[PDB]
Structure formats: structure tokens, C-alpha cells
């Protein structure tokens, strides 16, 4: 953990070749105290995230980390809320520009590829700090099917069968890895139940249909929809009865 | 943006930030480039930390033209930026000359960009070393561009973690009469020496350039080449 000069204040290399500012931006993701889990199925992709409403004064309809980037692409944001809104607005602009310039919907992989290209500049130029947010995009592709892509402050990006971000990212990753090792192409209900079970077991909350937001994309309707409290309650009851 | 250089000369006459970028490079995944008599092979350790990562979603060995390909060792996002830059420079050269860019010219332009990032204001050097393979004039070409913007013509070389022992292995295992398939065998052996665990068809990425052009090997072909190892 050696340092020499301003390697901890700007995005320049440390003596051992580390960008400490980027790592601090990564640590900034857990500042929000929220964990998001995305699971990809055989014909669907699901993003679930806990929504915290500390007081009844807050309008719970506005506390949403689920953002509709496009009709066919949804995202869940983890980390600083303002940086999350910035990344969401930039992703929406890039999707619209792709649709205008190329005439077809932007692929999910390329959306986060462009977003990570944008965020890499923040890790090379020293006049700006990296965004302390993590984007998880889900969308139904024309041929590849469901796609889940985590998209981090460093400009790294990768596809995922099931990923997680936030405070409990590692425990949820272990749970989802254990579930995936069983090698089951889960149906829509199974993917939703797996994501909800991952979040609940890792957090030990025994969710109510007001503490989580679920957004799904399916092959039959390749559009991003946010589940209502009744739809979430159906899955919660199904999980409880088993 | 800052207009002052972030890379400066130390009292000992060293571009310290470039050395630190090279240190970041030496901590990346191992990469091996071997120039055979009939082609070049670029192999890398594309190992993930969990099965949840989609192995085929992102590729470390990426093509630039129909005959030029790159494999990096260092930081992923910097390599993606340099991949886009190399592709754009190749498109500019093709548009100007109506001919695919020679490997040496693309290496020179990419190294010029990497040097620009060692002198321009408010930016840090790229934390990647690029192994560039191509085929021109019926002859194979292998180059390595370091963070400083310096390019070297290599018969066989290794970058990243455990690259010094990989180089020493390549000295005792490479001859100019090697064929492309034997070059792939040697590159896989070089990766295996620095590899920890077992190499599957998914946790390494291999690409080859020959008279037919550059193409990244599919996981099935990598599986056959790996079964050839054991």
C-alpha cells in the first residue's frame, strides 16, 4: 500500500500500480447501504433491490433505484443517488442516440460498454472523480436472449448469469454462485423467487411487499416493467408457502 | 481539464508515472505472443473469479482489422479504449489508402497515442501493454507496445504476472522453424507455467493470425488444443 505524491488524491498510478481513487469510488457504492441482485433465466432477467423509506414523510413512490433506460432495457443503480441519476441520464441519452444514428434498439452489452467507456475517462483524467455508482442493466436481446450486465465505476464491465452490487455484494454473489452451480435454466417465477430469496437470505429480512422493487424483462414481452406491490406480494406468498 | 503534464522527470531522470504504469501492467493477467513461421498466436489467461461472470461476454483478444489483433496485459478498460483507438486509426488508414493498415503502422500509431497520454495535460499513462499480431507481405508480425509508447518487434514474448519466467521459458522453447500449431502449443505451455489451477477451454483466450487473417479461436478449438497438452 505504498504511496508517492498525489496518487491518493487524483487518478494517477501508485508505486505498485494501483488507482486508489477508483478503489475509493468502489467503496462509495456501499455508502447508500443498499444491495441489488440481478438474476438471468432461460427466457427472463430480473433485478431486485431493497427500497428503504425511513419515515412516512418520504414519498415512497419516488424512492426507486429501478430506472427504465429504454422500453426494452431496464437498470438498477447502487451507490450515490446523484451519480446514479447521472449515469441513468447518460445511459438514456446514449440509447436514444444509438436508436437515432443506427435505427435499431441498442444492445444491452453495448449500452454498458459505452457507459464504461464514459466512466473510464473519469479514471484517466485527473480533473474529475469517478462516479460512485454501479449500474446493472437487464434486457432481452434479439438472439442472445436475456442479458445482465454489471457496470462499475472503473469502466469494467461483463455479462452475468447472476450478479449483485452494494453492501452485501459478496454474500449475494456466493449465494447466487451456489444456486447457479446446480445448473437449472430457471423459469420466470423461478428467477424472481431466486432473486428475492437471495436478497432475503443475505439480508435476513423476510421481505414485505413494500421493501423491495422488482423489475423484469421476458422474451414473450421484451419490455422492462416494474412489478407492483400485488405482483411482488404474489411471489412473496409463493416463497413463504414453500 | 488540467493543462499540465502529470508525468514528469524524476531527479534520477526517470518518468516515474510510466514506471508505475508498467508495474500495473506486470500485475495483469499473463499474456503470451509467439510468432511462428506461418503465423502468430496470442494467448491470455481469461480467468474469472466466479462462474457468474459470462466468459463469452467480454473478450481479451480482440480483432482490429481482418488481419490484425490485440491482446493486452494490464487494465481492462484502458485496453478497451486503446482497442477503439486502434480500430479508428485502422479505419482512417483504410479510408485514406483503400488498403488494410500494415501491422507496423498500426503499432506505431497506437504507440504514438500511448506516448501522447504520457505527455498530455491532466492524464495518466495507459496501464496496459499491447501485443499486436498481424500478417503483411506474406510475413507474420508481432509487436509489443508498452505504456511509455515504445514498441518492440518480438519473435516471442510474455507480459503480465510472471512474465520474466515466461520469457525465460520462451528462450528455451522457441525456434524460428516453429509452425502455427506448435506455436499454439508453446503459448499454451507458457500460460500453463504461470497458470494456477487448471486451464479449461473457457478460462483462457487464444487468437491466431495467418494468411487467412486474424481470428480468435472458439472455445471448442481451445479445448482441442488443451487436450493436446495433456
Amino acid at each position: 500500500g505504498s504511496s508517492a505524491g498525489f496518487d491518493r488524491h487524483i487518478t494517477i498510478f501508485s508505486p505498485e500500480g494501483r488507482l486508489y481513487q477508483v478503489e475509493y469510488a468502489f467503496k462509495a457504492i456501499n455508502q447508500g447501504g443498499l444491495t441489488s441482485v440481478a438474476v438471468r433465466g432461460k427466457d427472463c432477467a430480473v433485478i431486485v433491490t431493497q427500497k428503504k423509506v425511513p419515515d412516512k414523510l418520504l414519498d415512497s413512490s419516488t424512492v426507486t433505484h429501478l430506472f427504465k433506460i429504454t422500453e426494452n432495457i431496464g437498470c438498477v443503480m447502487t451507490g450515490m443517488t446523484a451519480d446514479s441519476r447521472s449515469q441513468v441520464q447518460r445511459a438514456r441519452y446514449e440509447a436514444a442516440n444509438w436508436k437515432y444514428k443506427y435505427g435499431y434498439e441498442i444492445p444491452v452489452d453495448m449500452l454498458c460498454k459505452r457507459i464504461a467507456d464514459i466512466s473510464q475517462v473519469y479514471t484517466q483524467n485527473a480533473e474529475m472523480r469517478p462516479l460512485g455508482c454501479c449500474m446493472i442493466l437487464i434486457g432481452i436481446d434479439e438472439e442472445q436472449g436475456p442479458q445482465v450486465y454489471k457496470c462499475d465505476p472503473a469502466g469494467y464491465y461483463c455479462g452475468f448469469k447472476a450478479t449483485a452490487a452494494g453492501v452485501k455484494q459478496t454474500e449475494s454473489t456466493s449465494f447466487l454462485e451456489k444456486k447457479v452451480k446446480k445448473k437449472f435454466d430457471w423459469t420466470f417465477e423461478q428467477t424472481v423467487e431466486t432473486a428475492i430469496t437471495c436478497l432475503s437470505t443475505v439480508l435476513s429480512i423476510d421481505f414485505k411487499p413494500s421493501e423491495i422493487e422488482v423489475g423484469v424483462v421476458t422474451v414473450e414481452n421484451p419490455k422492462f416493467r416494474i412489478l407492483t406491490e400485488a405482483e411482488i406480494d404474489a411471489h412473496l406468498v409463493a416463497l413463504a408457502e414453500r | 481539464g488540467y493543462s499540465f503534464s502529470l508525468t514528469t522527470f524524476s531527479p534520477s531522470g526517470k518518468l516515474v508515472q510510466i514506471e508505475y504504469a508498467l508495474a500495473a501492467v506486470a500485475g495483469g493477467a499473463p499474456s503470451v505472443g509467439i510468432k511462428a513461421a506461418n503465423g502468430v498466436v496470442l494467448a491470455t489467461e481469461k480467468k474469472q473469479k466466479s462462474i457468474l461472470y459470462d466468459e463469452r461476454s467480454v473478450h481479451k483478444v480482440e480483432p482490429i482489422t481482418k488481419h490484425i489483433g490485440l491482446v493486452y496485459s494490464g487494465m481492462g478498460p484502458d485496453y478497451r479504449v486503446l482497442v477503439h483507438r486502434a480500430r479508428k486509426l485502422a479505419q482512417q488508414y483504410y479510408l485514406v489508402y483503400q488498403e488494410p493498415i500494415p501491422t507496423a503502422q498500426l503499432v506505431q500509431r497506437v504507440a504514438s497515442v500511448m506516448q501522447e497520454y504520457t505527455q498530455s495535460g491532466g492524464v495518466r499513462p495507459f496501464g496496459v501493454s499491447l501485443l499486436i499480431c498481424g500478417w503483411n507481405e506474406g510475413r507474420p508480425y508481432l509487436f509489443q507496445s508498452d505504456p511509455s509508447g515504445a514498441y518492440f518487434a518480438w519473435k516471442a514474448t510474455a507480459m503480465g504476472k510472471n512474465y520474466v519466467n515466461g520469457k525465460t521459458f520462451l528462450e528455451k522453447r522457441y525456434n524460428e522453424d516453429l509452425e502455427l500449431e506448435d506455436a499454439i502449443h508453446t503459448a499454451i505451455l507458457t500460460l500453463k507455467e504461470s497458470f494456477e489451477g487448471q486451464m479449461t477451454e473457457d478460462n483462457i483466450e487464444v487468437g491466431i493470425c495467418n494468411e487467412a487473417g486474424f481470428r480468435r479461436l472458439t472455445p471448442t478449438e481451445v479445448k482441442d488444443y488443451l487436450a493436446a497438452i495433456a
Binding site: 443506427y102 444492445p107 453495448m110 460498454k113 | 480482440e62 480483432p63 482490429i64 477503439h84 480500430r87 479508428k88 479505419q91
Partner: peptide, 7 residues
């Protein structure tokens, strides 16, 4: 270029 980026 577009095809190379997309695949």
C-alpha cells in the same frame, strides 16, 4: 468499426 465494436 461498428461491427467490430458490436460483433
Amino acid at each position: 468499426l461498428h461491427s467490430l465494436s458490436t460483433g
